[PDB]
Amino acid sequence: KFGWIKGVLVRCMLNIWGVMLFIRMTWIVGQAGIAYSCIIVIMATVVTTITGCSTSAIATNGFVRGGGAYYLISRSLGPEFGGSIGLIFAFANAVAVAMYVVGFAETVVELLMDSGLLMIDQTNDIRVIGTITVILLLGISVAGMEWEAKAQIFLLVILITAIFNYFIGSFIAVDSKKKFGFFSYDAGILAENFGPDFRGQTFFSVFSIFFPAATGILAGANISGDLADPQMAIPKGTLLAILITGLVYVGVAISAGACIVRDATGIESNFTLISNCTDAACKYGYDFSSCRPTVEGEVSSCKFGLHNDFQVMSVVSGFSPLISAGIFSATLSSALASLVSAPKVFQALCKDNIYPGIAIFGKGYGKNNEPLRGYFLTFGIALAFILIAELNVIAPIISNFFLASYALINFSVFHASLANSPGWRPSFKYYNMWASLAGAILCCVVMFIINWWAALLTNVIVLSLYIYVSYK
């Protein structure tokens, strides 16, 4: 049995911190402003805080022993909400595996292209490296699960040293790191980056790429049978990990916006103060014109800055090669946590014969009854999406399915509080049914703003799976 720190807090902080922390935060401050990106982080934190209060209200409804994620939901609420939440959550983690390993493969491909190693084109090397790293992540999940419970504190002390490396490298003004952007903390760059640019995107198109960085909060409730006291561990670690990771996202956004310019040519300039005809806040001798795009229907033909290079946190970092290779720790820990959590929920769902034909993905081979057909189905669903070797098209799909699962959780606890269900007495201090209704309406409306036909498909599927289990 684990305590609340090592069993809930470290698990949720390792699942939440993933691709977008080191790869795509600076791009989000580049597209939006500092103000709009802080509004984005606060909105995702509001959604996940309401869903964390709803999950805590489920977890404090009696039912200590014999836990899990599907078990608590399907036993506090009915099977109609429980089966649909289980199916949508299993599919969401199975598709999130692809997002994390595509981010890992993109980082490895850019590290190879900084050297001379280049086999095929850039979008085909992500398909090759992403395929090798998901058939190796599959082998760990079915043969090496014992060491993974010890390795997670190792992964967390790699990740926090990466974050501290970035934050203390921001204050060190290096003259060689100019021409890649990155001057010191400056007021001119802070005023220039305070306000949107949206060079090909929109608000709610940048939100759909941020919001996978806020998911992963049900990693503590996914192990309730391995906790000491789940009534006190699940509301503590979840709502603490949400606060810690949200504050690190806000700090990364403000710190990236206040010291890096949006565009930069990677050519140094001999001047130290440019002729007074630009006034574009680079008074340090750098003229970063002829990189802003001409028309308002094209991307910039630059190579560095906040808008362009995707890896500028390795430039800002004091020791970029090894310490800011906590990208590997973050992405592989989140992908491995999502590779073992999607067949687990699906095997727990396929043991109650709720849905007719899926009952063959429940036969756990071996001694611990690990679902091997579930692992191979998750590997197939992940490998279908790795072949879309682009993160910015995978991430709105994950955002859609996680907003659907969180909306279903919030609406199910609202409906159980409203309907006066027989076994529903949630003794949690910060649970209100109208906050859950507000969170469900907010998740559904944002899911429709992001992409309306995928939202309509997901809502029709969830309504069909509810009406099927009602009249059975």
Ligand X SMILES: CCCCCCCC/C=C\CCCCCCCC(=O)O[C@@H](COC(=O)CCCCCCCCCCCCCCC)COP(=O)([O-])OCC[N+](C)(C)C
Q: Is 172 in the site for its own copies (CB under 8 A)?
A: no
Q: How far is CA 227 from the centre of its chain?
A: 24
Our CB check for Cl ion shows the closer of 18 and 86 to be: 18
Question: Which of 9, 20, 44, 335 lies at the binding interface for Cl ion (CB under 5 A)?
Answer: 20
Q: Is 216 in the site for K ion (CB under 5 A)?
A: yes
Stretch that binds its own copies, among 43-51, 228-236, 283-291, 449-457 (CB under 8 A): 449-457
* Binding partner of 19, given ligand X, Cl ion, its own copies, none, CB within 5-8 angstroms per partner class: Cl ion
Is 238 annotated for ligand binding?
A: no
- At what angle are helices 327-339 and 79-114 packed, to 10 degrees? 150
Q: Is 103 in the site for K ion (CB under 5 A)?
A: no
Rounded (10°) CA dihedral 170, 174, 175, 180: -40
Q: How is residue 25 written in tokens?
A: 């935060």
CB 234 within 8 A of CB 59: yes
Run of H or E residues at 466: helix 452-470
CB 240 within 8 A of CB 9: yes
Instruction: Using the Cα atoms of residue 167, residue 173, residue 174 and residue 177 in order, give the sign of their dihedral.
Output: positive
CB 408 within 8 A of CB 466: no
* Binding partner of 466, given Cl ion, its own copies, ligand X, none, CB within 5-8 angstroms per partner class: ligand X
* Binding partner of 451, given ligand X, its own copies, Cl ion, none, CB within 5-8 angstroms per partner class: ligand X
Q: Is 467 in the site for its own copies (CB under 8 A)?
A: yes
Query: Which residues neighbour 321 within 8 Å (Cβ) at sequence distance 6 or greater?
Result: 314
* Binding partner of 395, given Cl ion, ligand X, K ion, none, CB within 5-8 angstroms per partner class: none
**CB neighbours of residue 27 within 10 Å:** 23
Q: Is 198 in the site for ligand X (CB under 6 A)?
A: no
* Binding partner of 218, given its own copies, Cl ion, ligand X, none, CB within 5-8 angstroms per partner class: Cl ion
- Shortest distance, CB of residue 252 to its own copies, whole angstroms? 33
Query: Which residues neighbour 261 within 8 Å (Cβ) at sequence distance 6 or greater?
Result: 181, 183, 189, 192, 193, 281, 282, 288, 305, 306
Window 368 to 427, contacts with ligand X (CB under 6 A) = 396, 404, 407-408, 411, 415, 417-420
Stretch that binds K ion, among 15-23, 81-89, 129-137, 459-467 (CB under 5 A): 15-23
* Binding partner of 128, given Cl ion, ligand X, K ion, none, CB within 5-8 angstroms per partner class: none
Q: What would the DSSP string read from start to end of 4-26? A: HIIIIIHHHHHHHS-STTTSSSH
CB 105 within 8 A of CB 129: yes
Cite the DSSP H helix spans in 115-220: 122-135, 137-143, 145-169, 187-192, 207-210
Per-residue binding string, its own copies, 399-438, x by CB under 8 A, is: ----------------x--xx-------------------
CB 188 within 8 A of CB 281: yes
- In three-state secondary structure terms, 131 is helix
Instruction: Using the Cα atoms of residue 405, residue 411, residue 414 and residue 416 in order, give the sign of their dihedral.
Output: negative
- Shortest distance, CB of residue 460 to Cl ion, whole angstroms? 23
Q: Is 112 in the site for ligand X (CB under 6 A)?
A: no
If binding means CB under 6 A, how many residues of this protein chain bind ligand X?
45
Q: How is residue 365 written in tokens?
A: 């081979």
Is 402 annotated for ligand binding?
A: yes
Is 426 annotated for ligand binding?
A: no
Residues annotated within the binding site for chloride are 18-20, 89, 212-213, 216-217, 402, 406
The residues of the shown chain that bind its own copies, judged by CB under 8 A, are 415, 418-419, 441, 444-445, 448, 452-453, 456, 460, 467, 471
The residues of the shown chain that bind ligand X, judged by CB under 6 A, are 87, 91, 202, 204, 356, 396, 404, 407-408, 411, 415, 417-420, 432-434, 437-438, 440-442, 444-445, 449, 451-453, 456-468, 470-472
